Amino acid sequence: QLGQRKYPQVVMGMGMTSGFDDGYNLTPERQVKMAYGLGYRDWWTTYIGMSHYWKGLTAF
Amino acid sequence: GIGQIHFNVETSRKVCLDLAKSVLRLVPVYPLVSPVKKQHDDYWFVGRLGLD
């Protein structure tokens, strides 16, 4: 077991905006719970990735 | 204690050479061909959204 800090914060009545290109590596479970704990409760806006959502392939 | 049952390394080598000639008579040319034909410098490396 490893020690960890977990201090919930009072809600300031604001939403959170995030980008997919900056959150693909992190699991969705860790991102949502962390942001929710800080106090962002009502709204969420996610900008789709620029080069990580569409299908594609490489060829000669 | 056994005798002479197995070929020599040289004699078995001659047998393998005869086997190679027998197969080449049946198949005179290489039957396989790769999709690519030119050198690596003659093909672009590009990406596409897909076939359609």
Curated annotation (Swiss-Prot), chain A:
Chain's role: Assembles to form the non-contractile sheath that surrounds the tail tube. Allows viral attachment to the host by binding the bacterial outer membrane protein NfrA.
Subunit structure: Interacts with host NfrA receptor; this interaction is essential for viral adsorption to the host.
Organism: Enterobacteria phage N4
Gene for this chain: 65
UniProt-recorded name of the protein: Non-contractile tail sheath
Domain of life: Viruses
Note: It is uncommon for short-tailed phages to have a tail tube inside a non-contractile sheath.
Localization, UniProt: Virion
